[PDB]
Design a protein around this ligand. Structure first.
Ligand code: HEM
Ligand SMILES: O=C(O)Cc1ccccc1Nc1c(Cl)cccc1Cl
Length: 408
């Protein structure tokens, strides 16, 4: 059988790409960033072509365009790995809904994420952060920052918000990781079913004995009024549980790696804590850990600066690339905790903009202040070159981060 004997250059490169450095664009993404025009063709894992959005203002425009639907069950939604077919087959939380249905479900959860509520959560967050730090610092001279700090902290916080008992954390933390990091459909489906069966039992328990937290409130109110389906409640709680776990944990580990590679800026941050909120925004822009959250499908033709998105085409708004748009962020590939990182897209834009964004901002501020206060000598226990980054088909991050510090 004959083989390929011609040049292999394509104008639709394979997407997504994997990071080789935790805080820099994959080489292929830098190329997309540099090509003029808002859109570029890519080839997804199964050979199907899709569009990516690579510029900041076009990304805002298209995330705001109701002709780009968030319906993951659509046959033309841009799947980036075989594991996505698990979500195409499963019931949908409001992240997969379009207006008006999106708003009726999202509004059932917003009361837990208001600015006033986030402010009232600071003592619990600080207590949780410092508690896990107490344990880690006492347990040995080295640690895995991920399993001992980065993951348990947001896990405990989101479980309190939801009413999910932390006694079961080994089970649902493992199931959350399996679902988010699954590479095939069968392991994704099993992880989803594991969480679904758990949450289903929690719902019945709350119907017997009304419970705390957001799940308790949805059971007692919207579910008892038929305003949400039981299966929808499960999907909604599952989305909040997984996002509340995995996103902040990834930001924590990648922020530590990044700050230790920029010691001048880390030292400036320690000397002036009023810089921490701005540094968190810059880290969000720079690390942009959730490109997998940009998929859309066109329900009508859309004209974009001379290019045409046709009805039925998949579109991925790649916020990591849009966040490196030099017409918005001067010298976009430089970390600068003093820059204005305003208007970044790490949380999206428009009706689906991250519900948890200010909880995440609170958590990362408390976490960075606590690391600088309690472990100012924190350092990586292995070279950055020995770390293993997750692939571009999931939330960016590291699954293990060996660290050490000065003893007690
Ligand atoms: C820590 C950093 C985080 C990042 C970078 C991030 C990123 C994102 C992005 C980019 C979207 C837009 C998805 C889209 O347009 O389809 C989104 C939506 C969402 N995020 Fe976050 N997220 C973070 C933390 C959290 C946390 C802590 C929660 C807590 C529950 C959360 C819950 C949600 C929900 C429910 C949505 C769907 C909003 C909607 O569809 O209306 N996220 N997130
Ligand atoms: O988005 C979903 O429906 C669930 C899901 C599963 C695996 C990986 C990511 C996600 N969602 C997701 C998104 Cl789209 C953005 C931020 C955080 C999370 Cl957990």
């Amino acid at each position: 059988t004959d083989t390929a004997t011609t040049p292999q250059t394509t104008d639709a490169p394979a997407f997504p790409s994997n990071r080789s450095c935790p805080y820099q664009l994959p080489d292929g993404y830098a190329q997309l960033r540099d090509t003029p025009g808002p859109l570029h063709r890519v080839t997804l894992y199964d050979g199907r072509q899709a569009w990516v959005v690579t510029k900041h203002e076009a990304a805002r425009k298209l995330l705001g365009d109701p002709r780009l639907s968030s319906n993951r069950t659509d046959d033309n939604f841009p799947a980036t790995s075989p594991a996505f077919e698990a979500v195409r087959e499963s019931p949908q939380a409001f992240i997969g809904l379009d207006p008006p249905e999106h708003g009726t479900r999202r509004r059932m959860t917003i009361s837990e994420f208001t600015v006033k509520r986030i402010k009232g959560m600071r003592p619990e967050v600080e207590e949780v952060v410092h508690g896990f730090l107490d344990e880690m610092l006492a347990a040995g001279p080295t640690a895995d920052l991920v399993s001992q700090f980065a993951l348990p902290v947001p896990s405990m916080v989101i479980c309190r918000l939801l009413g999910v008992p932390y006694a079961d954390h080994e089970f649902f933390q493992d199931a959350s990781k399996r679902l988010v990091q699954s590479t095939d459909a069968q392991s994704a489906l099993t992880a989803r079913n594991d969480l679904a069966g758990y949450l289903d039992g929690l719902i019945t328990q709350f119907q017997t004995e009304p419970g705390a937290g957001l799940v308790g409130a949805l059971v007692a109110d919207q579910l008892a009024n038929g305003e949400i389906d039981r299966e929808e409640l499960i999907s909604t709680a599952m989305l909040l549980l997984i996002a509340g776990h995995e996103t902040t944990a990834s930001m924590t580990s990648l922020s530590v790696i990044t700050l230790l590679d920029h010691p001048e800026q880390y030292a400036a941050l320690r000397a002036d804590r009023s810089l921490v909120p701005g540094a968190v925004e810059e880290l969000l822009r720079y690390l942009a850990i959730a490109d997998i959250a940009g998929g859309r499908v066109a329900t009508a033709d859309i004209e974009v600066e001379g290019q045409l998105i046709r009805a039925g085409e998949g579109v991925i708004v790649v916020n990591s690339i849009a966040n490196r748009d030099g017409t918005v962020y001067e010298d976009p590939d430089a970390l600068d905790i003093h820059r204005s990182a305003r208007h970044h897209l790490a949380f999206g834009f428009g009706v689906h903009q991250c519900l948890g964004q200010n909880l995440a901002r609170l958590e990362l501020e408390v976490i960075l202040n606590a690391l600088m206060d309690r472990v100012p000598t924190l350092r990586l226990a292995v070279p950055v070159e020995q770390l293993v980054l997750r692939p571009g088909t999931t939330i960016q991050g590291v699954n293990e981060l060996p660290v050490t510090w000065h003893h007690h």
